[PDB]
């Protein structure tokens, strides 16, 4: 059906999109994290 | 010309192969830090 050109498009989105919220996930979760060792040095 | 569908191919096995290796470097390079913690030749 459309498992073409267009769609080899929507994974190279899809692995972008996967790489950067994995970043910005363990970035996110670092400032809860931190309540422990709450950034006062 | 190229920069068509063959190209956005090449990409998927770019970020593929990229995000394999990524886990196989902090992977390859805990044995060597194990030194300080391991046994020493």
Avoid at 2 to 17: D, F, I, N
Avoid at 23 to 31: A, C, G, P, Y
Wanted: proline share 0%; glycine share 2%; net charge negative.
């Amino acid at each position: 059906g459309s498992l073409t050109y267009e769609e080899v498009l929507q994974e190279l989105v899809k692995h972008k999109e996967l790489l950067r919220r994995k970043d910005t996930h363990i970035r996110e979760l670092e400032d809860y994290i931190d309540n422990l060792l709450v950034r006062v040095m």
